Amino acid sequence: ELDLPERNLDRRELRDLVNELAAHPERWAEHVMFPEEGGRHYASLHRDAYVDVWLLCWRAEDDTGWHDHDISSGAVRVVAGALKECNPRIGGEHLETVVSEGESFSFGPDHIHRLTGAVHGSVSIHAFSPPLWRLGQYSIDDSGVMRRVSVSY
Amino acid sequence: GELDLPERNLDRRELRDLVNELAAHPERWAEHVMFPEEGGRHYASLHRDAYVDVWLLCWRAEDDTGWHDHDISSGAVRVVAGALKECNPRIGGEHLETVVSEGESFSFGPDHIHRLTGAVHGSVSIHAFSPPLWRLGQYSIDDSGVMRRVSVSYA
Ligand SMILES: [Mg+2]
Ligand SMILES: [Mn+2]
Ligand SMILES: [Mn+2]
């Protein structure tokens, strides 16, 4: 439990949150784990009615896929390693951005992105507000038409 | 008002059956026909409950829904009069367009992304959603090309 307001957080507060937490390894160091081949390691660092905070440990094999967070704003802090944040572009020229250790970014609830290209041993802290309850997972058929599946997580 | 429908969700086929049968019963919707001189596309509610939403839409040639999805709602359209253009997005910009003319209908599942543009003034269509259309995702494109989905409450 942290000293946060009794409400949903905007993306500026979420960014400060992931960084403040990166600066307190005492609360996330023990949850680091790189499954040799299970699923992308999730570790709840704090969950309440207003915020979900996760620690993610990445293998080179991990990819979120194109997705959105419905109504949830979000922030990411790379603790170690580096991630690839891609934002969709109609036309196929998808904007791609390498986010290196020490760096962080945030976004509002309308964000569509994909996290991948994780160098082995990468560690990141992800916070969502309101809590992440439903996501939209996009897919493109062989023909080219795009879909959005609402999923539970 | 309210239609006498089952107390459960309807699938795509049932939603298409519904909009087609309502077209054949103008007593249920003829009175709600209206084409705004100005003030946004006209929507009139025919039925809203915990399982199904039904709307009558009256189109002017300018009207446009924009690119959007229906979250978890399956849906169906019947064009009663005139015609609409049903566009489906394509990464590349070559969006798939399809004129839906009077008498014609189509259904879709919850994963559908589309845009409907009124093709002719005086067009009228019936739209049904199950589960109810209480949340809608409206897509936008910045000149950078980056696309974003704004979730909206339509309940
Ligand atoms: Mg709390
Ligand atoms: Mn995400
Ligand atoms: Mn629609």
**Which residue in A71, A89, A145 is closest to B90 by CB distance?**
A145
The number of CA neighbours under 13 Å toward the Cβ of B51 is 12
The full set of domain ranges for chain A reads: 11-152
Resolution limit in angstroms? 2.0
Which residues touch B143 (CB under 8 Å, ≥6 apart)?
A: none
Closest-CA distance, A153 to chain B, in angstroms, reads 15
Is A137 in the B-facing interface, judged by CB distances under 8 Å? no
User: What is the homologous superfamily of the domain B12-153 according to CATH?
Assistant: Jelly Rolls (2.60.120.10)
Please classify residue B154 by burial: count the beta carbons closer than 10 Å to its beta carbon, then call 0-12 exposed, 13-18 middle and 19+ buried: middle
SS3 A20: helix
Widest distance between CA atoms in chain B: 49
Burial profile B87-108: b = 16 or more Cβ within 10 angstroms, e = fewer: bbbebeeebeeeebebebbbbb
In this structure, which residues have their CB less than 5 angstroms from ion ligand 1? A 48
A11-152 under CATH 3.40.50.2020, yes or no: no
Residue type at position A59: R
